[PDB]
Amino acid sequence: RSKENLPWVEKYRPETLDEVYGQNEVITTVRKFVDEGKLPHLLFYGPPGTGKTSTIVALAREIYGKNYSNMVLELNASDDRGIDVVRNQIKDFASTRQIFSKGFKLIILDEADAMTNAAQNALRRVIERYTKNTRFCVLANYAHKLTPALLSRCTRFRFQPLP
Amino acid sequence: SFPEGKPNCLLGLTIVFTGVLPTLERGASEALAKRYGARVTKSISSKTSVVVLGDEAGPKKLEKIKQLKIKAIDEEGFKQLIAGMPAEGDGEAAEKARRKLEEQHNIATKEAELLVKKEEERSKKLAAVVREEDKLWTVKYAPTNLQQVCGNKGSVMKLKNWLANWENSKKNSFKHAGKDGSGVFRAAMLYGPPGIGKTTAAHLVAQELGYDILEQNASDVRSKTLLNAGVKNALDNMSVVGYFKHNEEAQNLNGKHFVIIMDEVDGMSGGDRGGVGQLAQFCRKTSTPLILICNERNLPKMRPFDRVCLDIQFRRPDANSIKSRLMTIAIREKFKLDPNVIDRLIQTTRGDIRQVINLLSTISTTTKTINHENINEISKAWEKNIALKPFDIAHKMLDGQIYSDIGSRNFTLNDKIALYFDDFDFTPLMIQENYLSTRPSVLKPGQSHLEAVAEAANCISLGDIVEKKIRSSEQLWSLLPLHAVLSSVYPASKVAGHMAGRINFTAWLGQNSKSAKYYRLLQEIHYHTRLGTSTDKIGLRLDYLPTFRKRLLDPFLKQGADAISSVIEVMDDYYLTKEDWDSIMEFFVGPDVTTAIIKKIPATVKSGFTRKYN
Amino acid sequence: MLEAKFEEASLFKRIIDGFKDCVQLVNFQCKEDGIIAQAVDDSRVLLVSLEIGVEAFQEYRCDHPVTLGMDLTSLSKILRCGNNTDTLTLIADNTPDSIILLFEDTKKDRIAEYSLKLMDIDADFLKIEELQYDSTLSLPSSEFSKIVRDLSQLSDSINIMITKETIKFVADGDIGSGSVIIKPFVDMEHPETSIKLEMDQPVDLTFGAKYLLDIIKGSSLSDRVGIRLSSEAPALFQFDLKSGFLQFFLAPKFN
Amino acid sequence: TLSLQLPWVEKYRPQVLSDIVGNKETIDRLQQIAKDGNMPHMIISGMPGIGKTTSVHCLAHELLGRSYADGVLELNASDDRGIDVVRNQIKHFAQKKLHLPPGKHKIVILDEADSMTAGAQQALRRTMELYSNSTRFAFACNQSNKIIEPLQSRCAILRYSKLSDEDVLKRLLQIIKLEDVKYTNDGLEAIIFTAEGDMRQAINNLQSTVAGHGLVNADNVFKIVDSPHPLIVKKMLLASNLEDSIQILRTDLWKKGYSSIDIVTTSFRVTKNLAQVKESVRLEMIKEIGLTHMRILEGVGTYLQLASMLAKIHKLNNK
DNA sequence: GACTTAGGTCTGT
DNA sequence: ACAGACCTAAGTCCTTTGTACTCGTAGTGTCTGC
DNA sequence: GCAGACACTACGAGTACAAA
């Protein structure tokens, strides 16, 4: 393969925060956040193919390094959107420490607009209680699906269509 | 606006605010009348002292006024009326109300003194475990006997009588009902709105009659296995805690036996596997009294209990009964309460003495005087938001005042959507059933009733489309607010007005069940006739059944008892049964209805037909 | 305070396992005589009374009389933690909010302290008075357990009729019925297997099955059961201990 | 970096009951119960971020003193709050014996209580009354309608309201002074306007503005926090001419990346919450947006359908 | 300004 | 005392789907005792 | 080795779906 037998959409996926274009405001603000260390709970909402997943993956790569796939809880909310995930995986990950290196924890919830209302109503306190050691990232195409409570605990960034 | 008046100026006057008043709403007028001791009733009657109507009165109420010759005034007349009349109502009717108020105050003072004496006695005992202050106002003032329960006097008397002659009924083997008639049933249910003292009444009647009380929370214990073990074993065994509780004294023979007071029976699990239907089998065989208690008796999961229990409906106590109790608790607790406020408090709480108790307990911490100045805010902050019955949703939805220019500001469109969302399964059906039985009052200039009805029907059809899209394989529940407008709000706004007759229930459910049953029967007959008939389900009913009647029932009508064989032959030509014949004869409509015909064939022909077929 | 040291922790574990499936909450009143505790069943059909005297304990000290309100399931969980040969020391401080069970082994240096939070139970100290019993029986525990468990399968009722020199248990159920009859025999060679009868007046009584298996669950405490039967009075089932017993007061069905 | 600082929402959470700004009457009553004792069962309802959890926690801490560790039981929506927790955890906690100050009692705080199952809510009814002498239950929820009426009867109903701009300004000014942040009056006003009474969002947006740009100004705040979507939706709906409304939809909504479903839903909500337009006209425009919403949810989401919806609305307004 | 059914309390004959 | 007269509290009253959640029953595997 | 005994996992029936 060598990342060359892949579709151009996947092979040209950005790997660093400097290879994401268009959303310069969001990239600069988030880079400043992570440099000063005051990174809040993020909610990237925007149209498809505007570079939200790539942005958050590059952010995890920058903050944690090359081994970001073992030290960040990346959950596809479409595949698992139950309250059981909130009780079992998300909360255990947030509460405990890290097996690899010292630091805070990141939970990247992809397509959380599919998350059930019960799951979001459960997460609205998982986000608050463990704010000492973990931070939450919520990726959304549609913000109307998401509960209003989960839209008040996360700093909102809108991803504009690419100019 | 309204001039001030001397305290209790309007005392002893029965005032009905029928007419619409430009400056005050109906609630505001009622409040400003009850501030001065006036009595407000919903019905104009012979004893109605004055009727207040500025304009826009009702023809039925107007006819009542004309017949009863009741004096009437307007809003400006009411403003003049408030100031002029003297304090405390003078007139004999005012003297009667004065005597009643003084008597109630004396009873409150006497019972407060009695409570003080009891507290002093308890302090003397303690000097010689939880402190009384630590207890809640709801439990520290809980009734210790039947003579302190507020309201539902007949209900507590009936429960006492049933439990008293339960032993005699058991001796009579429950076959004889008795004079009161409660002895035939083996179990009794107390059902009503929450907090009207059902549990308290049951506990106190069981205490007075001497039986040993066993309390089970049916919500906590609802599974069939736990219910079975515990209370099945308890139904016919004696009480060890009762045998050791001085059986040697002979006053109480009921001390050994059990009274099982089951609370929150409405929380039982449903279904045949669930225990809600299994407990009826329990009541069908009991050697000890059973007192089930529930809030929502008219709930489908609770259907099996209908015939095996004595249903006793506890109703919301009227304010007059509870005034005395609130006065005693107010005199004891050193917070000032005036009687004129009391009524609205009950209306704020909807007859829940418990929540009135808690309301006073919470509010008296900071404000020590509950008076007419702050009662409006208390009501606005403590009002019970209870989901209305579908009949009430239909009544308010098809109301002219709601969709008028002035009424729209008071009740916004969002509130109408909320009324729909209270019950999202029946309001579309209730409006469809009762949008054509109202006299409209919002007809635009140049529009008749029929045009508004047609527009409403078109909107109901669009709402049915929206409902199908909502309630199909796509499950587009995000259209639920839209289905709120198209199905309920818009047609009701189109045909808003006064209710002509009564609010009927949705007939769609019953006819839908009938259609399902008839479709099932048609499937059985069609699949029986399939081997000969080359048709579908609908074609059989449309074409063959009219012809099948002429070859099945008409020979019985004309040629006589010798038709059976021939009928049997055609029966055996399509694998029909007697049930099949009865089903086919039940599918015809209009002119060809056979219900009267099958009665007119003589019983001999029917008996011969069944005998020959068998 | 209170410092009561058991010789062995298995005894308390078996005692609690005996009567933990019938009643859930208990009150252990610790007096200078020992630990007296009764529990009324939730159905209020059975009563359990337990006395463990000072002779049972290695070293029992109590300064002011106290009551410990306890949950049987939590105590069973705690007692399961200790080893069989450990010495369990119940230690309680003034105004008790928890009881500090202390398992300790003299062979090693392992010490295990478990604090069980005390439950607040409000119930009356109902007075217990003996009466002349028409029938008093002493039977092997394992035998009685077996008849009860065999008959409970067919039906939910156990009818004990003590006719002249005969004890018959009968169960009548929807599918099938069962009867087991025992004659009284006294064996000198083994006193344990002996069957002992006293019959002032013949008795017939029907008792609930579930409470009866709850009673037979105490078979581990003693080798022999003591059954006292009176027609109109609750039946006594006694499992005797070295310094006490596990008395069960059972209520028969209406007849 | 490895470590992160506390959010100002949690760092500056009120630790005493006096710090809570809005809903003065209820807070003063809670302070009076805090001093006197004997707290009744209560249900705290309102909108997100007006200090409901903080109020109950200040009350519980002040009541129970040093006994907060044992006398107070948290149950949250993140935990399992079925009938099992009422049978096993809640019942055992309420039966527990614990010696407290003469007036105070053990406290059960059930946060996010609106999501409790019907079975658990019904089972809690008798645990509330039987053990009330020792334990007092407290519920906090956004919607009081989800809690069953039998439970509502046994407790005092305290309803919180949206925070007025003045109280939000006071709290933000206090946080501004403690954290030495540079600000302008326009920036603070924009922050309150964007928060819309949600103090949590106000503090979060203030901290984000300070972190990203360094100065609380109108430009910076509006850059980091967008102007409300319902406002531009309302402006598009209430346009005098069709072309103006089309321009608003094209530039402010479609070109800025808002999805069609969002525009249609916000249009429906703005229509039903609008007051200047008469009810009949509002209902007919609601019908048109309902047709458009059906079309969008059927997969046809384009600028053309929204434009046709606006054209129909303008035809309806133009008679 | 909806119908029937029902309860609680008073006064008059 | 007794039916009537006021007044008020209340009852009329049961449909699927798609997927997530819950709760009790039924079934399974695995540890301990004899 | 052989049988129960709780304890975990699989199955099945009931209920609610929005907005603020």
Ligand SMILES: Nc1ncnc2c1ncn2[C@@H]1O[C@H](COP(=O)(O)OP(=O)(O)OP(O)(O)=S)[C@@H](O)[C@H]1O
């Ligand atoms: N800003 C961008 N800069 C560079 N490439 C981009 C950008 N946005 C999208 N792409 C390309 O498009 C691909 C998809 O990006 P994603 O971030 O996965 O899309 P998305 O923003 O997550 O939208 P979704 O997945 O529909 S919610 C990337 O792998 C890149 O190849």
Ligand SMILES: Nc1ncnc2c1ncn2[C@@H]1O[C@H](COP(=O)(O)OP(=O)(O)OP(O)(O)=S)[C@@H](O)[C@H]1O
């Ligand atoms: N009629 C009444 N008179 C006096 N006090 C009452 C009355 N009804 C209720 N109360 C008070 O309310 C407390 C609780 O009464 P309950 O009998 O539990 O009400 P409830 O009818 O059983 O409502 P539930 O439990 O929700 S079904 C009592 O202890 C009294 O303090």
Ligand SMILES: Nc1ncnc2c1ncn2[C@@H]1O[C@H](COP(=O)(O)OP(=O)(O)OP(O)(O)=S)[C@@H](O)[C@H]1O
């Ligand atoms: N009245 C207030 N005074 C001061 N800070 C407040 C106030 N209301 C909210 N906050 C801030 O907002 C944060 C969240 O408060 P909470 O009470 O947890 O929110 P909530 O009102 O309970 O709504 P939730 O959590 O969505 S159910 C607090 O920690 C404070 O920083």
Ligand SMILES: [Mg+2]
């Ligand atoms: Mg993506």
Ligand SMILES: [Mg+2]
């Ligand atoms: Mg009750």
Ligand SMILES: [Mg+2]
């Ligand atoms: Mg909260």
